[PDB]
Design a protein around this ligand. Structure first.
Ligand SMILES: CCCCCCCCCCCCC/C=C/[C@H](O)[C@H](N)CO
Lengths: 225, 206, 48
């Protein structure tokens, strides 16, 4: 019997959904024609439970960007992708100076073309990604209002991702984007227990206090199966 | 780091005895945050305030004494990067973070609220995946665990970053009949190993 | 200084109060010099 299947190489390597981004025509949010999405991979529950097995993790990522209209059909619409590193200008509009793509990487794809694929190296300044950081990023005293900085690793914010439709006029068709990731060239450390409680917030592992779900099922008697 | 670090072998690395924790039948267990306990104690604590960079290994030792008529079990485990959660009021719609008193208990330590989830939302039965030792009052009344330095960076700030926590959890409640001594202390002594300091600076408390 | 570290634990049926005997001596590196008189012998009267 071969152990290749239970190895971390094949278990960590495949596509999963890390982000859901929409650009509706009518609404209070993305209707301006562009979207600015800060990069967070923990808004998705099931892949988060896989990455929480281990504390420190070092890997590379391949991405897949699928575009479709919320009803599922497609239109010949051209889209623009751009990656914004920390410190780089974030776009204030669709005609904004930031989308002009000088030194920032960009991807051009249509809605009739197959999904776009890119490869992202290891961009963290440390040796590996730190999922659970115990401490504070800031010096000095921390009051109740400054307690938000707890559990925040400054090495985990690698930039911001943004999308828009090309052209000056507004596009009549709505667009829904689904971001995918495949982990490759992975190295792992410090195993951790698997979380048995439902997720609540992205940034910190909060659990609902009223009901604590037992990790095992219950029965009537210990001597009866 | 381009600086040449200090190695005060005798004044830094030695056994540090902490306060004793009185055991009770409903006791839920306590936890400490290293290296936040020794920041106020001895030469180790003073040089930690004058130095920005910190790397050392630790020595964990736990002491719980009992007689032949006492039956109990303690679980002493080391969990790297132990993050405290919050019940969020119990409803789950409120966003709240634990204050500095719970996240940085200091030398005295802090007590667990819901030991089943360890306030991490994770099962207690899986705690043995990390390095652990069992204290069974019928055989071993002591425990010793040698934990090296584990971080993604060689040096790091001792004040903000807590490396790992220490969990002494009374899994099996100690039972004793009437007339026996009801005061059972729990003594935890710790020592640093191979400490290196860098970035000599002014006095910084927190 | 001698200090209580944990506690004195005793079963049922055994005394709860114990006594500790302290011993003292020297080592091989112990060295003395400059002989003199001590205070531990006194004559307030003749020896009959
Ligand atoms: C051409 C467009 C390329 C878009 C590139 C976006 C970079 C996304 C990289 C994701 C790799 C993991 C980064 C961090 C993941 C988690 O969100 C962090 N732990 C946040 O705490």
């Amino acid at each position: 019997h071969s152990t290749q299947e239970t190895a971390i190489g094949n278990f960590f390597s495949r596509a999963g959904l890390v982000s859901i981004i929409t650009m509706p025509t009518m609404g209070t949010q993305n209707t301006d024609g562009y979207a600015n999405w800060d990069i967070d991979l923990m808004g998705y529950a099931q892949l988060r439970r896989k990455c929480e097995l281990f504390t420190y993790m070092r890997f590379d990522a391949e991405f897949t960007f699928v575009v479709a209209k919320p009803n599922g059909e497609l239109v010949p619409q051209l889209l623009q992708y751009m990656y914004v590193p920390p410190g780089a200008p974030k776009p204030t509009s669709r005609d904004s100076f930031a989308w002009q793509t000088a030194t920032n990487p960009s991807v051009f794809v249509k809605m009739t073309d197959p999904p776009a694929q890119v490869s992202v190296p290891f961009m963290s300044p440390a040796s590996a990604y730190q999922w659970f950081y115990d401490g504070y990023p800031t010096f000095g005293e921390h009051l109740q209002a400054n307690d938000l900085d707890y559990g925040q690793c400054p090495n985990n914010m690698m930039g911001t991702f943004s999308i828009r439709t090309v052209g000056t006029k507004k596009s009549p068709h709505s667009i829904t984007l689904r971001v995918y990731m495949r982990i490759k060239h992975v190295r792992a450390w410090i195993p951790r227990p698997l979380r048995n409680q439902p997720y609540l917030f992205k940034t910190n592992p909060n659990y609902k206090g009223n009901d604590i779900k037992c990790t095992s099922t219950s029965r009537d008697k210990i001597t009866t199966l | 780091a381009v600086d040449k670090p200090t190695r005060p072998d005798v004044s830094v690395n030695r056994f540090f005895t902490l306060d004793t924790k009185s055991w009770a039948k409903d006791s839920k267990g306590w936890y400490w945050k290293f290296p936040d306990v020794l920041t106020e104690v001895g030469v180790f604590g003073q040089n930690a305030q004058f130095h920005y960079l910190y790397r050392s290994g630790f020595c964990v030792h736990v002491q719980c004494n009992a007689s032949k008529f006492h039956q109990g079990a303690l679980l002493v485990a080391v969990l790297p990067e132990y993050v405290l959660g919050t019940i969020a009021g119990g409803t789950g719609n409120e966003n709240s973070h634990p204050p500095y008193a719970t996240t940085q208990p200091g030398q005295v330590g802090a007590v667990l609220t819901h030991p089943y989830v360890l306030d991490a939302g994770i099962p207690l039965s899986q705690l043995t995946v990390c390095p652990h030792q069992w204290i069974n009052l019928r055989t071993n009344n002591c425990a010793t665990i040698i934990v090296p330095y584990m971080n993604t960076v060689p040096f790091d700030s001792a004040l903000n970053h807590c490396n790992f926590g220490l969990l002494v959890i009374p899994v099996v409640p100690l039972d004793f009949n009437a007339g026996a001594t009801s005061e059972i202390p729990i003594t935890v002594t710790i020592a640093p190993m191979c400490a290196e300091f860098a970035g000599l600076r002014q006095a910084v408390k927190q | 200084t001698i200090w209580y570290q944990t506690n004195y634990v005793v079963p049922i049926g055994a005394p709860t109060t114990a006594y500790i005997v302290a011993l003292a001596a020297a080592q091989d590196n112990f060295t003395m010099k400059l002989c003199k008189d001590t205070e531990d012998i006194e004559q307030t009267a003749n020896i009959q």
